[PDB]
Amino acid sequence: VGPELLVPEVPNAGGPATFPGAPGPIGTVIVTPQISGPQQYSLVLGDGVQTLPPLVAQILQNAGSAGNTKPLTVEPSTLAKMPVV
Amino acid sequence: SFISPSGQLNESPIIADRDSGALYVRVGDRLYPALNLASARLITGRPDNPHLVRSSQIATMPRGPLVGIPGAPSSFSPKSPPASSWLVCDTVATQGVTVTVIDGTPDLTGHRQILSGSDAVVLRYGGDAWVIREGRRSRIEPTNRAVLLPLGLTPEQVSQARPMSRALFDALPVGPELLVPEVPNAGGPATFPGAPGPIGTVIVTPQISGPQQYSLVLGDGVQTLPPLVAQILQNAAGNTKPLTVEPSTLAKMPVVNRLDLSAYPDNPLEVVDIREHPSTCWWWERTAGENRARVRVVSGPTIPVAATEMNKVVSLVKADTSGRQADQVYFGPDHANFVAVTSESLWWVTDAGARFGVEDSKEARDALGLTLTPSLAPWVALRLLPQGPTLSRADALVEHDTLPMDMTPAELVV
C-alpha cells in the first residue's frame, strides 16, 4: 500500500501570512510571467512560499477554485524577496 | 635435468634458493640476503632476474646482515602505450562519498553518457552550490531567482543538492560565476555619437530574414547578445522592452567585444536526476605529441568499468584520513606502469596501487631498465595514490639487523 491520492490538505487555510509582502492569503497559488522563461508555480504558506509541480498546481486551482480559474502573477524581482519554506 | 631440475653458481650476481625461494645477492665473496628484487637490481647494477641455485650450495658460502629498501617493488614489467587516459570518479551513497581512480580507457556502454551541451549537474562543496558542464565548475547562488528562472533551475533543487568530494572539487577547473553580467559605465553617457540611449540599455533590431538581433550598448559601442543572455539582462522593474532600431544605423555604429558570456548556455539546463546517476567522473585524455589534452565529464549509474571486471577493483588501506588519498584503484586495458609528469618527475606505479619515485640518472635507469620513454599523466590524479620511498642507489646500500615496525596497520580478514 502506498499513500492515498487526495487533494493536498493545506494547514490553516485562509488565514493571514506571517511574513511581509505576501501577495495573498495563505493557500493561494502564485506564478511567474512567461516572458522571463519557463513558468514556476508556487504556494504561499504561513511563513513563506513552497514550489509546486505543474500537475499539483492544477489540482489545487481546480479544487480551490470556488469560481476562480487563474493564479496570481508576480514579478521576478519581488518574488526573490519572499522567504522559501 | 628434466626429472629433478636444479642449478649451480655462475657469473650472475643475483641468486635464489631452488626450494625456499629466498633472494640473495653477492658482494665480493660474501652473500647477503636481500629484501626484494628492486633493491637487488639497484645494488648490483645489472637488470636481470634471479637465478635458481641448489640449496645445499648456498649453505657453503659466508653470510651477512639484511640489505636493501623495505617494501620496494618486487616485479618489473615496463608498459607504455601510445594513448594515456586517466579518470577520477566520485560516487555518492543513498550520506558520504567515495573516490575511485581509474587508469586506462573507460567503458561507455549502458546508460552511461558523456555530459555536454545543455546537460548539467549540481553538487555541493564548501557550503556552496556548483554547476558542472563542458568541463568546468561554476558557482551559483540560490537566492538570485533572476538567474535561476531563465536558466530553468529551482531554489529547492539548488539547495538540496548532494555533496562532492575534495578530490573531484580540486581536479575540475573553475570558470566565471553564473551571475548577472555587470556592465561598465552603466547609466553613464556614451563615448561615441548616435548612441540611442544611456549605457547599459538593451537594443534590438528585427529582421525580415532570421530572428531578432539583440545588442548591449557599451560606453564605446554595441556588442551582440545571445537570446538567453538578453533574457537575463531583461530582468532587473526594468524596461518592458528594449529599444527597437533600424539595421543600417546599428550596422554603422561601432562594435565592441569587451564582456565575457562564455558560461551562459544556449537553452534551459537538462539537470541530471542524481538519484538514477549516482556516479560522475572527470576524464583526461591525451595522445602522444599533441600539444593539449582533452578534458571531459562522464556520468552514469555505476563506475565506468565493465561488470565482468567490477570484481577486480583494489581497495587501499588508506591510513591517511585527509582527502589526498583515494579509496579504490582500478587498472583497465592499456594502462601505464612508467609515468612522467610536468622540471619533470618520473614515477613507477605498482599493480597494488603504490607509486615510487625513480631517479632521472643513467645509473638508476640502467640498473632497473626503464630505457623506454615514459607516458604522461596529470598530477591532480596521480597524487591520490600512496607514495613509497624513491629508488635511489645512494640509499639502497644499507644494512640492518631488524626493521622498524609499522604503526597503525589494518586488519586482514579471511
Side-chain angles (χ1 to χ4, degrees):
Chain A
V1 173
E4 194 168 11
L5 287 169
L6 304 173
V7 177
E9 191 154 37
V10 183
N12 197 22
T18 310
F19 73 93
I26 193 179
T28 49
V29 177
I30 294 153
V31 76
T32 58
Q34 191 170 118
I35 71 174
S36 66
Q39 300 190 262
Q40 314 296 313
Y41 294 97
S42 63
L43 182 67
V44 55
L45 304 185
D47 302 345
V49 301
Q50 178 170 339
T51 297
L52 295 179
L55 186 147
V56 183
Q58 295 167 71
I59 295 172
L60 286 169
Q61 286 190 70
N62 198 311
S65 170
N68 184 41
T69 63
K70 291 188 179 180
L72 297 176
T73 53
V74 298
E75 294 75 14
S77 58
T78 194
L79 177 57
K81 304 184 183 182
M82 300 194 287
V84 179
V85 168
Chain B
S1 76
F2 290 120
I3 289 166
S4 52
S6 191
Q8 179 175 233
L9 291 167
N10 78 85
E11 201 69 359
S12 187
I14 305 180
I15 72 179
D17 178 317
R18 174 69 271 196
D19 70 57
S20 190
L23 273 171
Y24 297 93
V25 73
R26 80 182 295 118
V27 181
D29 65 342
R30 190 175 294 269
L31 292 181
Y32 292 79
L35 295 174
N36 42 61
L37 181 60
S39 62
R41 282 188 176 186
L42 205 57
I43 287 165
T44 55
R46 299 189 187 197
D48 212 346
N49 287 47
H51 179 74
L52 303 183
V53 174
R54 180 176 66 239
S55 53
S56 68
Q57 191 77 342
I58 283 166
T60 68
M61 298 209 74
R63 298 294 169 70
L66 288 75
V67 306
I69 307 167
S74 196
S75 192
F76 286 96
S77 183
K79 277 183 285 197
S80 190
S84 184
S85 308
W86 286 86
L87 301 89
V88 174
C89 290
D90 179 309
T91 291
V92 65
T94 59
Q95 298 188 9
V97 174
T98 61
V99 177
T100 305
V101 176
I102 294 172
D103 180 351
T105 58
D107 177 1
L108 275 59
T109 61
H111 291 289
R112 301 184 182 104
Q113 60 151 107
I114 297 166
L115 187 147
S116 64
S118 298
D119 295 1
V121 64
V122 181
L123 294 178
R124 280 282 206 165
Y125 188 73
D128 296 1
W130 302 83
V131 182
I132 300 175
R133 62 180 295 273
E134 289 297 326
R136 298 184 295 182
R137 67 175 168 88
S138 178
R139 185 172 170 273
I140 186 63
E141 303 200 343
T143 305
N144 198 342
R145 284 184 173 276
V147 177
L148 300 179
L149 182 66
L151 188 66
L153 263 57
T154 300
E156 195 69 22
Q157 180 178 26
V158 174
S159 59
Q160 299 294 359
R162 263 61 175 200
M164 186 178 189
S165 182
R166 186 177 173 195
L168 181 60
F169 176 80
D170 280 355
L172 285 157
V174 296
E177 305 189 50
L178 285 174
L179 295 175
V180 178
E182 185 158 24
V183 189
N185 190 37
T191 312
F192 68 98
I199 298 309
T201 55
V202 181
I203 304 184
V204 73
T205 189
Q207 300 193 163
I208 301 299
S209 185
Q212 305 82 359
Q213 303 302 304
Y214 296 90
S215 65
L216 170 58
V217 72
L218 305 178
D220 312 318
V222 292
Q223 85 166 62
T224 302
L225 300 171
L228 190 148
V229 182
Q231 290 179 355
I232 292 178
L233 285 167
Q234 177 59 85
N235 286 265
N239 298 349
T240 57
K241 277 103 178 185
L243 306 183
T244 52
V245 304
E246 177 215 51
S248 308
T249 188
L250 186 143
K252 288 178 178 182
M253 283 192 290
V255 176
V256 166
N257 292 287
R258 192 148 62 212
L259 302 182
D260 182 5
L261 283 63
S262 182
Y264 314 103
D266 298 344
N267 288 293
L269 295 182
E270 285 293 351
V271 183
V272 177
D273 44 345
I274 200 172
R275 198 190 298 122
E276 291 191 15
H277 287 189
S279 198
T280 56
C281 303
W282 165 88
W283 178 11
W284 180 106
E285 181 78 15
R286 190 174 188 173
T287 301
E290 299 301 339
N291 294 315
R292 296 187 296 152
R294 299 184 65 195
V295 56
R296 288 185 281 187
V297 174
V298 175
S299 69
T302 59
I303 294 170
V305 65
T308 303
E309 308 311 312
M310 190 70 71
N311 204 46
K312 79 217 291 171
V313 175
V314 183
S315 177
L316 308 185
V317 176
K318 197 183 69 173
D320 181 356
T321 55
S322 72
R324 254 62 183 151
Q325 183 172 354
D327 303 304
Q328 293 178 340
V329 185
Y330 172 80
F331 299 92
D334 301 348
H335 69 75
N337 288 339
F338 188 34
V339 159
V341 304
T342 307
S343 185
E344 74 194 337
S345 190
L346 270 56
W347 300 96
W348 174 264
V349 183
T350 68
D351 198 25
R355 64 178 169 93
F356 297 87
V358 184
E359 293 292 358
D360 64 355
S361 299
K362 280 66 174 180
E363 275 290 358
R365 298 282 284 280
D366 293 347
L368 297 177
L370 312 179
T371 302
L372 79 176
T373 55
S375 288
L376 283 297
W379 181 250
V380 302
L382 183 65
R383 74 184 172 217
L384 299 172
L385 301 181
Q387 175 171 354
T390 62
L391 283 62
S392 316
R393 179 175 166 89
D395 72 22
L397 292 169
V398 295
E399 294 179 314
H400 318 95
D401 293 326
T402 58
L403 310 182
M405 294 298 287
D406 178 32
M407 305 301 177
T408 68
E411 188 178 41
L412 169 59
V413 59
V414 300

